Design a protein around this nucleic acid. Structure first.
Ligand code: MG
Ligand code: MG
Ligand code: MG
Length: 297
DNA sequence: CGTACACCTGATAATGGAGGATACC
DNA sequence: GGTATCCTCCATTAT
DNA sequence: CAGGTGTACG
């Protein structure tokens, strides 16, 4: 387990796992008829709770860490004042690079409006609803019916987004990457199974450009599409690239969260493979046991 | 024998919401 | 009253 | 996120 936090790592992690949300709830007690709330949220498996704790401390002890689902916890900041004072200045200096950036810049604009209390104003609210419409899944049915006049504000959409620091990658992969160990059944290998190591990152196709630039950035790998939908894998299967490129990279720029343990086990598997012990029965069982302990606690 | 890119599919916690209660001015 | 935050729970799909 | 397979190639 690893919870040392660096700004760029946090940004990578938030690009992987965070959400910038705007809620506009109907409620007769508010003059406009609507309550406007802005929320910054990161949800993880409960095995990474310690990571949410380091994140809270990273952001000045602000926010709340709460049970989200069956085996997950949420870290959330929902105080307008608090979002403006620390969250915005952080992400203005250390900018997101995925499509999450677009949600961020919209979310930032609603906060600018909330800062001058324009959300408590009919025209202010309409402008916020226009913003909400281009954030995440956009307008609810109830909001669309309540403001059927409103033109979504254009989704900003950046240009060549280029990996800003090695720690960014560290954080990003700590969220949406994986270090895979496979045992493939083989008829040519004496021992009956091929030990294969795979480094992989998964992301929605809308971030194809970023995904493609990982091939230059790391000097290896390739992209594939999931035939079942819009979802891309950056993948390294070449064991020379794993040892010469990926393993050294994440030895310097460290995985955060419980996935650090997994990278460490994956490395041990790579050592057994380096020494060629994976083609003996004992080395194969060593990998099976390292393989089964992985992603646990 | 052994490896590696192209292709395949399962699991489930995230992704991104929601509703009700209460604090605060 | 008006407004701002806390607290608990969830269905579909990006991991 | 994660576990596999088919098969060309040295
Ligand atoms: Mg993600
Ligand atoms: Mg994750
Ligand atoms: Mg998951």
């Amino acid at each position: 387990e690893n919870s040392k936090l660096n700004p760029w790592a946090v940004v990578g992690f938030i690009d992987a796992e965070g959400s910038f949300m705007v809620r506009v709830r109907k409620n007769s007690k508010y003059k406009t008829g609507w309550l406007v709330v802005a929320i910054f949220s990161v949800t993880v498996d409960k095995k990474d709770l310690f990571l949410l704790e380091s994140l809270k401390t990273f952001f000045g002890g602000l926010g709340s860490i709460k049970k989200s689902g069956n085996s997950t916890f949420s870290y959330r900041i929902e105080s307008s004042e608090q979002l403006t004072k620390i969250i915005l200045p952080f992400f203005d200096k250390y900018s997101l690079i995925t499509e999450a950036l677009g949600d961020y810049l919209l979310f930032k604009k609603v906060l600018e409006l909330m800062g001058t209390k324009e959300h408590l104003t009919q025209r202010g609210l309409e402008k916020i609803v226009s913003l909400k419409a281009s954030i995440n899944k956009g307008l609810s049915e109830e909001l669309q019916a309540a403001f059927p006049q409103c033109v979504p504000t254009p989704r900003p959409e950046i240009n060549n987004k280029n990996i800003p620091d090695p720690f960014w990658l560290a954080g990003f992969v700590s969220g949406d990457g994986s270090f895979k160990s496979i045992l493939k059944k083989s008829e040519s290998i004496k021992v009956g199974f091929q030990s294969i190591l795979v480094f992989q990152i998964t992301q929605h196709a809308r971030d194809v450009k970023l995904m493609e630039s990982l091939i230059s950035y790391l000097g290896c790998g390739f992209i594939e599409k999931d035939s079942r939908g819009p979802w891309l894998y950056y993948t390294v299967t070449n064991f020379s690239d794993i040892q010469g490129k990926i393993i050294p990279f994440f030895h310097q720029y460290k995985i955060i969260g419980s996935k650090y343990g997994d990278y460490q086990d994956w490395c041990k598997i790579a050592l057994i493979m380096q020494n060629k012990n994976h083609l003996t029965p004992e080395g194969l069982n060593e990998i099976r046991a390292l393989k089964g302990g992985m992603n646990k606690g």
